[PDB]
């Protein structure tokens, strides 16, 4: 017998499946004998200390900056002063160095939120002593001469002694639930082209800068013994909080410039001497 | 101070924090490149994008896309040196014609090439095609569907593959030179015709041997206005 | 997993020869050091073979065998007076062949597994260094009849760097020293052959 097939359906043809989607379903064709055969990880697999998420990369301690503190530095003087942006280090000049992992990986996402931890380690002995404060200012900056304005903001005082470290949590209070990245989401200028207001007029986004500032002041001056150094150095470590968040994948802000060479066909391209 | 409440899942239930899910999003390798039937065919090295494929200001102009270095995927692959598992390529032909284009896998041999290239410097490849040698192949027909999604397997002797090297063009020992790839993919045309190639991770893919962020540079500040005029 | 398959013959351990400690040549730490400058760097186990600790009993089995797996520990000892202050970081980097120029920063040192030595408190540091190489085994020795395709004796690099420079007081000691120790916690050896001098 040869009966007819009465069943039918309306269909919409598409070129690919799950091409934008990172997960779901795939239209993949295996270049194997057995189409269900996959690469084995029975013997050799991932190591347990390795990160699974990009947030776990943002939970690694990285040296943000360092600064010196001396016995001549009077009370009220701003030792440290910056804009705590995980987006950019500077708004006004070129950067070239070894960026923190949390600022590196934040440079991939368009949006960020949550608290940002700072750990201040002090390069000293047990015979250095003196009091400093940690200030977190929102919606406004304080005058450098006026310490009293900074005392009103969210602060944490530390007494230098035997313990030469202090943990600190920079909170997250803004008008928005999430802050967006200051740097551009797409920059096609690669070869350091001379930029004018016409070129700035056709930017992909606008640099929505932040006026949030982290400052560290002298409460009581470093009064060391004569036997030890007068001018010590402070390590300022930084990572994302345990409730840190990221969203919206975009072009990377930072990009490697140290020891980069383009590839060439091995070994036709003059490899054989 | 208070740690507060997280903002994960507040806007929407589209979490993009996973490493593999970043790596599974595709990247453009070759944008509108020619195929010459005079040669054997276009060669693609089986490796994820990284600082290897990074363009520099005022170097030799390759056939690669320039902003590959500045993609998120290459940025993640500049944190890990080890990787294992299959990869998925999406190839698109710039044609409507019936003349098919054969895509043939090559396993790990040792060499590391790309672009249109002659094999063993001959002057004829139609009578002796690479796609009819014995290797695993799948053909594209532009008239039916000019795209494809092939999945190159991990066929090599190494527990992990080398992502990147400190110098790409350094003539060091040749056996360790070949650990940057797991073989090649071959694209063979009939006539001179344009195409584009995309790369993404397979379902089975893994990275390890974490190094952390290298020395970087930026100048994005210079190409935007502030919100104070 | 890869051990039993890649080696038809069973591998041997020499716990008496391997698990003991072994010093090497010292490290001078000056006040003249800047940030991200190398005090020391080692390509293990080659720099425990050729240069430092040639005639150690730990280097007895490395003559005869041509393959092996290597899990180490490295205890570092700092000794400076209480009127100094400085920070020294030491990290490890697995399969560092043709990757010494890049990810060599103190930032990468923080990111990779490391130890953090203060030079005033005079603390010690223990680097548990497992075996993570892109093959089953690493080749032990070079040879004049061997192939020149594979670079042996390098599955990891040690990096001793200034994290923050050493500072001293008035008329203080201008430098202090650090003595590195090492030992083998899991040393398995395959491919028995005739003995050779170590490099």
């Amino acid at each position: 017998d040869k009966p007819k097939d009465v069943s039918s359906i309306t269909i919409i043809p598409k070129p690919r499946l799950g091409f934008p989607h990172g997960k779901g379903k795939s239209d993949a064709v295996a270049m194997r004998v057995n189409p269900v055969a996959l690469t084995s990880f029975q013997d050799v697999s991932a190591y347990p200390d390795e990160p699974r998420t990009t947030l776990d990369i943002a939970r690694i301690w990285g040296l943000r900056s360092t600064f010196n503190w001396g016995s001549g530095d009077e009370h009220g003087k701003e030792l440290f002063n910056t804009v705590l942006d995980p987006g950019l280090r500077f708004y006004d000049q070129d950067y070239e160095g070894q960026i923190t992992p949390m600022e590196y990986v934040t440079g991939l996402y368009n949006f960020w939120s949550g608290p940002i931890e700072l750990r201040f380690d002090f390069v000293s002995n047990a015979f250095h002593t003196g009091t400093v404060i940690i200030s977190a200012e929102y919606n406004r900056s304080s005058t450098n001469t006026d310490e009293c304005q900074s005392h009103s903001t969210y602060t944490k005082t530390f007494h230098l002694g035997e313990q030469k470290s202090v943990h600190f949590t920079v909170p997250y209070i803004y008008d928005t639930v999430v802050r967006r990245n200051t740097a551009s989401a797409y920059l096609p200028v690669t070869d350091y082209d001379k930029v004018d207001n016409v070129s700035r007029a056709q930017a992909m986004g606008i640099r929505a800068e932040s006026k949030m500032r982290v400052k560290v002041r002298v409460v009581n001056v470093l009064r060391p013994v004569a036997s030890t150094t007068s001018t010590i150095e402070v390590l300022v470590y930084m990572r994302g909080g345990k409730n840190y968040a990221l969203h919206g994948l975009k072009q990377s802000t930072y990009w490697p410039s140290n020891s980069v060479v383009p590839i060439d066909s091995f070994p036709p391209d003059g490899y054989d001497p | 101070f208070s740690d507060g409440v997280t903002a994960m899942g507040f806007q929407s239930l589209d979490t993009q924090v996973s490493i593999k899910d970043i790596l599974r999003r595709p990247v453009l390798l070759f944008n509108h490149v020619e195929l010459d039937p005079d040669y054997t065919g276009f060669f693609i090295p089986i490796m994820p994008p990284s600082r290897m494929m990074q363009y520099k200001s005022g170097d030799k102009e390759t056939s690669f896309q320039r902003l590959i270095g500045r993609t998120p995927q290459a940025a993640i692959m500049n944190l890990f040196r080890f990787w294992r598992g299959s990869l998925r390529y999406t190839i698109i032909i710039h044609s409507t014609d019936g003349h098919p284009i054969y895509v043939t896998h090559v396993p790990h041999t040792g060499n590391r090439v790309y672009g249109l290239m002659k094999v063993n410097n001959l002057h004829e490849y139609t009578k002796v095609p690479i796609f009819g040698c014995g290797l695993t192949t799948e053909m594209i027909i532009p008239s039916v569907n000019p795209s494809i999604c092939v999945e190159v397997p991990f066929d090599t002797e190494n527990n992990w593959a080398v992502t990147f090297d400190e110098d790409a063009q350094r003539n060091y020992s040749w056996r360790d030179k070949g650990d940057t790839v797991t073989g090649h993919l071959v694209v063979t045309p009939v006539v001179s015709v344009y195409m584009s190639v995309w790369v993404e991770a397979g379902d089975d893919f893994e990275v390890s041997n974490f190094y952390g962020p290298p020395s970087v540079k930026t100048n994005d500040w210079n190409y935007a206005f502030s919100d104070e005029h | 997993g890869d051990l039993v398959i890649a080696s038809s013959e069973p591998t041997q351990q020499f716990r008496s020869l391997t698990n003991r400690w072994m010093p090497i040549n010292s490290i001078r730490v000056t006040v003249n050091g800047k940030r991200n400058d190398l005090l020391a760097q080692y390509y293990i186990p080659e720099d425990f073979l050729s240069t430092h600790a040639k005639c150690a009993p730990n280097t007895i089995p490395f003559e005869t065998y041509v393959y092996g797996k290597y899990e180490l520990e490295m205890k570092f000892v700092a000794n400076g007076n209480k009127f100094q202050c400085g920070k020294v970081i030491i990290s490890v980097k697995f399969d560092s062949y043709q990757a010494d120029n890049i990810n060599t920063g103190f930032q990468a040192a923080l990111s990779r597994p490391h130890i953090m030595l203060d030079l005033s408190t005079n603390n010690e540091g223990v680097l548990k260094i497992p075996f993570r190489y892109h093959r089953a085994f690493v080749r032990n020795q070079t040879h004049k009849t061997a192939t020149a395709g594979v670079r042996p004796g390098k599955f990891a690099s040690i990096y001793v760097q200034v994290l923050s420079p050493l500072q001293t007081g008035e008329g203080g000691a201008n430098d202090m020293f650090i003595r590195p120790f090492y030992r083998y916690t899991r040393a398995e050896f395959a491919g028995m052959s005739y003995k050779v001098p170590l490099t």
Binding site: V261, G270 | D167, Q169, R170, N171, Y172, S173 | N36, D37, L38, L39, A40, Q41, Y42, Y43, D47, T51, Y97, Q98, D100, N101, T104, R151, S157
Partner: peptide, 26 residues
């Protein structure tokens, strides 16, 4: 030629990589 083919003799070894003895490469 390409200058990137070989590391110069002063800072290199027989394997054409940076010497572990040589510190000031950084």
């Amino acid at each position: 030629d390409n200058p990137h083919r070989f590391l110069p003799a002063n800072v290199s070894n027989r394997w054409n990589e940076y010497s572990s003895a040589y510190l000031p490469r950084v």
